[PDB]
Design a binder for these strands. Structure first.
Ligand SMILES: O=C1c2ccc(O)c(O)c2C(=O)N1Cc1ccc(F)c(Cl)c1
Ligand SMILES: O=C1c2ccc(O)c(O)c2C(=O)N1Cc1ccc(F)c(Cl)c1
Ligand SMILES: [Mg+2]
Ligand SMILES: [Mg+2]
Ligand SMILES: [Mg+2]
Ligand SMILES: [Mg+2]
Ligand SMILES: [Zn+2]
Ligand SMILES: [Zn+2]
Lengths: 184, 368, 368, 184
DNA sequence: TGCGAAATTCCATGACA
DNA sequence: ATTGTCATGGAATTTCGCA
DNA sequence: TGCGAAATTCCATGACA
DNA sequence: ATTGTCATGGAATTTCGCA
């Protein structure tokens, strides 16, 4: 059996509702399985329509052989199935209540939630603007398991934005005080 | 004047007047019998006036001015005087065309890596499609990989919006653009400093300098036109199709598509290439690094038989950019301060600032 | 289809499939192990579909289409099938550029006598001068002698008024013009029949055909521009000055002015030539007849390395005249009815009328 | 002394008042002395101004060394003298009451008056339109004395409008009846 | 070690308005 | 302070398949 | 029968928007 | 049923002036 490659499998999921930011409430998260490269798209709803619109952007840059998701409604609709079939993309579902991706992906998604939350606090309404920098951060983050960043694995070169401050990702005492108050 | 023409009438030799002809007086005027006929020899103090009246009849060049003068006069080295005047006729210098071609084009090196250098540019206005009129085109120098964005105007603000989306993926060292309003604004300059991106500009009025992206504009318009045959020009929804279609098209001279040069492997598009199926990603990236460095690179073509290359200190004139009806096509003469490369120079304007300019927008001033 | 690929799997030879390779079955599909790798050999009944899907990705030409197909398939003489499709893609045929140049230009003979052939044309719109916007330019073919008329529009009516004044002096055999509205009107045609004057027209959209007068327009605008430097563009009062200035300017290759070729003697203008002062008029006219016949005439230049010349029965396409944004630059294919000369043909339109057309506005249809 | 040439001498004169035609009342007549070639210009008055305007057209085609005229006021004004001097044209006058041109010119002018009068009658108001054809007629008229037309002598070629009907130039009985009536 | 045909490479042409 | 480019389809040249 | 310089001719370049 | 042209100024080549 053949080695794993970029575009073999895209893992997708929604994060949200978030506080509204420039009109948007969710983030569709796509992570390439082989490289761990992440793309993020702001949406107004977790709908098939919003997924299709967002994936139409990504799939005008690169098309995965397989999309993996949970059984969210947006992903199990017959429209989303028609969309995928039109593009020769096989759809793949984890069993309900048992969400399974891969070690690398799981960790990546975990990084994503924690990084989001860290930058939310103080400015829970300004995340739309930060999505680019988040992505750069994530995609230039060193992989303990592989010797390389997603950027390096995707393009086979160093990046011009190395993120040498592999960072806290943890909330300071002041920031928990901000987030235990915002949630009041 | 009289001094010279005196000695002459009395048969003494003056340098310049051949001895073998005979030089009489008649009607108060010195004359000479030359093979073409009898010509008046004017006093030297009169010659510049004569040359100037002949030249001014129709602002003729060397031969056509000489032929007028020769009808009535002869004197030593007429063309030297004709040329002297041509080199001082402001009106001729700034209206006449050049007859020397630019030296042969440079083929700058392909940027070594993806994201080393972006070329960006606008196409449009196009027929309105969902309220959109323009397309921002972003071409990666190394790979040819291209991103397309519909906009409502060629504005800084829409450039910035589009590049915030693009730079989600990666940040380029350099963005090369021409001097359109959108790219030269101080807002755009801040946007790039904020990000560590160096802005490089084309010399003014020289689209060839953005050749990388201009050439991709051609292919974009060409594929749009084909896709729109016998349908209304609804191009907005085709941008994404065209983008993917072009990024996955082979260049016959390279044998690779831009997608391939960027990723080293095809995604799930039709007719995906499968040669590296048994390689690990690491082996594949290693083959990609090899392929990237050995790509065909064109060389500087032969100069045309009558080209000129700029020399420091030369008088040269800059092409007028948008010349009014019946107005000159050239600015007044200026001096080459610095030869940046054989096709690019710095001159002492006319305003008179320093100006970095393409040689294609220059002529060498005639007659020194 | 199956017939052919059957015989193959059982080791028998089919013309086109080289025997030295081995052709297995796998996943329900015939395959072959070729030096580049393993490729599927599709049934013949499937090939046109494949070629067409590859071509349609980005409407690529020969090599770029082939390179897609070769990723997955191999079969005998692939390019023959690729080319077959390219020659049937309407969208490619009418959008793509030509890559063959026109054959070398003709240099038609100088008209033998003054008044044998006039070339006429309009310059403008120019900045308003005394309510005037255009200039009718009339150039005598043989001599280059030129008449200028200010007009308010490029109309038949102002053409007629101007030529009634000009033809006071003499009536030309032929007037050559391009297909501007002013010259192709039935009113203008009557005006010429009334006078015995044959109207000759340029092929459409080919100003080179009126080269005689176009080239004089250049000199007119050039001298006007010089005379107007640093003054407001008040050109109306300079027409007469420019007219006389140009008619009395030497052409360096001929050594005569247009005035001289027309009259055989200079009038009282500056620097009048005096060589025939001792000749009778009759002797002078006799010298003029000699000079008129021995003028330099240029020859047809060398063809470029990749030019095409039209052949009766060829498919060729006419350039679209004013093509809309994102619309094709070429009309659908048409047939050469008659080769009038190697640079001019009659084709079976697209409308489908007979149309006489310059080869510069044609491309030969690709792929036969 | 050197042979006579075209542009050596232009003979000019006014003919009129005529009946008004498209606003015009006079004809300025110019005849080249050597060739007998004739140019005609319609004017509104026999003024220096109208002469200058008309001669400005002709002298943008060819400039005579000498203009010969009678002592008409238009020709003796200091303006007309300034005009001629500016163009290096010498002015030449016949003595008052003694108008003398040359045999060839005299005859030519006589042809002009007679041809005008012939075509006037019937349509005394339509002469403006006919001036071109008159000129062609005159300039393609065979010279008994020289073997050539003015056209031939000016351009050294045959014309495309030969006027092989060297014509009556005389008024028919009906046309005298028309002209003895118009003058009533 | 050499032939005819197919495959590949060469490269002038033209458009990025 | 910067700099032309590259799809296209006939033609030229090289390689392939076979002996 | 030959040299240096001047004169003439050659001719690629570019504009007729 | 029609078709490129020719001013321009360096360079190449020829001629001139003298011996
Ligand atoms: O004339 C312009 C122009 C003006 C101003 C712009 O901003 C701009 O993008 C363009 C542009 O693309 N082009 C077309 C063109 C013409 C000739 C050439 F060689 C190439 Cl490459 C391109
Ligand atoms: O484009 C036009 C045109 C269109 C329509 C007309 O009526 C007309 O007179 C002209 C015209 O003079 N030109 C300029 C031009 C461009 C390229 C050339 F080779 C030559 Cl010769 C002249
Ligand atoms: Mg631009
Ligand atoms: Mg551009
Ligand atoms: Mg025209
Ligand atoms: Mg024209
Ligand atoms: Zn001048
Ligand atoms: Zn096509």
């Amino acid at each position: 059996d053949r080695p794993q490659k970029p575009f073999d499998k895209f893992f997708i999921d929604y994060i949200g509702p978030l506080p509204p930011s420039q009109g948007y409430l969710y983030v569709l998260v796509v992570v390439d399985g082989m490289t761990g490269f992440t793309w993020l798209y702001p949406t107004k709803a977790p709908s098939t329509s919003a997924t299709v619109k967002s994936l139409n952007v990504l799939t005008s840059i690169a098309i995965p052989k397989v999309i993996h998701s949970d059984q969210g409604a947006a992903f199990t609709s017959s429209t989303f199935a028609e969309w995928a079939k039109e593009r020769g993309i096989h759809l793949e579902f984890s069993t309900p209540y048992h969400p399974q991706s891969s070690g690398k992906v799981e960790r990546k998604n975990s990084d994503i939630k924690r990084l989001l939350t860290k930058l939310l606090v103080g400015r829970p309404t300004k995340w739309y603007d930060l999505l680019p920098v988040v992505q750069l951060a994530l995609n230039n983050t060193y992989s303990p398991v592989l010797k390389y960043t997603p950027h390096q694995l995707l393009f086979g070169i160093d990046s011009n934005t190395p993120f040498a401050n592999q960072d806290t990702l943890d909330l300071t005492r002041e920031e928990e005080l901000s987030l235990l108050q915002e949630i009041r | 004047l009289d001094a010279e023409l005196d000695q002459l009438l009395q048969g003494h030799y003056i340098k310049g007047y051949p001895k073998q002809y005979t030089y009489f007086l008649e009607d108060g005027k010195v004359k000479v019998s030359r093979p073409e006929g009898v010509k008046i020899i004017p006093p030297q103090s009169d010659r510049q006036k004569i040359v100037l009246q002949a030249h001014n009849l129709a602002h003729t060049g060397r031969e056509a001015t000489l032929l007028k003068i020769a009808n009535l006069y002869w004197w030593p080295n007429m063309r030297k005087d004709v040329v002297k005047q041509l080199g001082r006729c402001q009106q001729c210098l700034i209206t006449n065309a050049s007859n020397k071609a630019s030296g042969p084009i440079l083929r700058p090196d392909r940027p070594q890596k993806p994201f080393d250098k972006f070329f960006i540019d606008y196409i449009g206005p196009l027929p309105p499609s969902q309220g959109y009129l323009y397309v921002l085109v972003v071409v990666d120098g190394m790979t040819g990989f291209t991103w397309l964005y519909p906009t409502k105007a060629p504005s800084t603000s829409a450039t910035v919006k589009s590049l915030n989306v693009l730079t989600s993926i990666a940040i380029p060292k350099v963005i090369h653009s021409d001097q359109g309003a959108a790219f030269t604004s101080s807002t755009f300059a801040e946007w790039a400093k904020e990000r560590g991106i160096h802005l490089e500009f084309s010399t003014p009025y020289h689209p060839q300098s953005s050749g990388k992206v201009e050439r991709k504009n051609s292919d974009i318009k060409r594929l749009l036109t084909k896709l729109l045959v016998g349908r209304p020009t609804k191009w907005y929804d085709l941008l994404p199709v065209v983008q993917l279609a072009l990024n996955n098209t082979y260049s016959p001279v390279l044998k690779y598509t831009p997608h391939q040069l960027l990723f080293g492997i095809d995604s799930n598009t039709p007719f995906a290439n499968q040669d590296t199926l048994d390689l690990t990603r690491e082996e594949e990236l290693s083959l990609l690094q090899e392929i990237r460095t050995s790509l065909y690179h064109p060389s500087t073509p032969p100069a045309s038989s009558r080209s000129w290359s700029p020399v420091v200190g030369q008088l040269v004139q800059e092409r007028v950019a948008r010349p009014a009806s019946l107005r000159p096509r050239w600015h007044k003469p200026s001096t080459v301060l610095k030869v940046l490369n054989p096709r690019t120079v710095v001159i002492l304007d006319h305003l008179g600032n320093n100006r970095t300019v393409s040689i294609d927008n220059l002529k060498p001033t005639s007659h020194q």
